[PDB]
Design a protein around this ligand. Structure first.
Ligand SMILES: [Cl-]
Ligand SMILES: [Cl-]
Lengths: 142, 6, 141
């Protein structure tokens, strides 16, 4: 289904990376944030929603998602929040993203740059179509 | 306010 | 032409908004940064390139685009360095929602959302976010 995303967090070098996965395509977007707060999480989701037509987000039900800033953001953007609901068979994608980050880490002075290089690699990898090609094909309305 | 506000 | 973008700066409240416009669609992305630095510019371009198939970026030629860190980012991502209304439109939306946010950055991203999702014309029309996705999907196929 084209409008369904899953958000996950992963912690590295003592920083936090918020990852949004477009479930149908495996396409990802990611940002390093200083901590898993309501306001940081809200701002991430507002940006994501401005970029793609986001109808539903599955979350881990962390306290950052139960916050009223996140709820305000989701209602403003018309996003339905599904807290603590798995769509079924991820920690692979976290271990994978961290695998790729580990491979490019020596090419960037700062972790945030390495994370973006890793996102680029991930979304462009042919598996035949890339995740980046699949998300657009799935979302296109004509 | 959408963010920290309000 | 599917891989061409234009990047422009706007100054508001002593902050800088970097605005990337996908030329063929009018779709935008934007970020708010403290100052127009080579580091921030490179970071914005790698984020853009991991999301969309960016081949060419047209810019204002300022010193942020000349830096060795921007050249290293562009080399790595395969980007060649070699719409003014869209920016005035963005600025006007930002003004209209500005008071609904404590921070400029939240107003900027609301305006981005409003801009990319707004249908142009009547029944039969498209939003910029629909146009970009349709342009790229058609190009792949
Ligand atoms: Cl999270
Ligand atoms: Cl600029």
């Amino acid at each position: 289904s084209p409008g369904i995303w899953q958000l996950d967090c992963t912690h590295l070098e003592g920083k936090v990376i918020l990852v949004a996965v477009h479930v149908a395509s495996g396409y990802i977007e990611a940002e390093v944030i200083p901590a898993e707060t309501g306001q940081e999480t809200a701002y991430f989701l507002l940006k994501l929603a401005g970029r793609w037509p986001v109808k539903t987000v599955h979350t881990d039900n962390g306290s950052n998602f139960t916050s009223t800033t996140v709820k305000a953001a989701c209602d403003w953007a018309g996003i339905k929040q599904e807290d603590g609901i798995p769509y079924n068979p991820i920690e692979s994608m976290n271990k994978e993203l961290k695998k790729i980050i580990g491979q490019v880490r020596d090419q960037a002075e700062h972790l945030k740059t390495a994370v973006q290089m890793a996102v680029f690699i991930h979304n462009h990898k042919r598996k035949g179509y890339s995740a980046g090609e699949r998300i657009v094909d799935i979302i296109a309305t004509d | 306010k959408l963010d920290n506000x309000x």
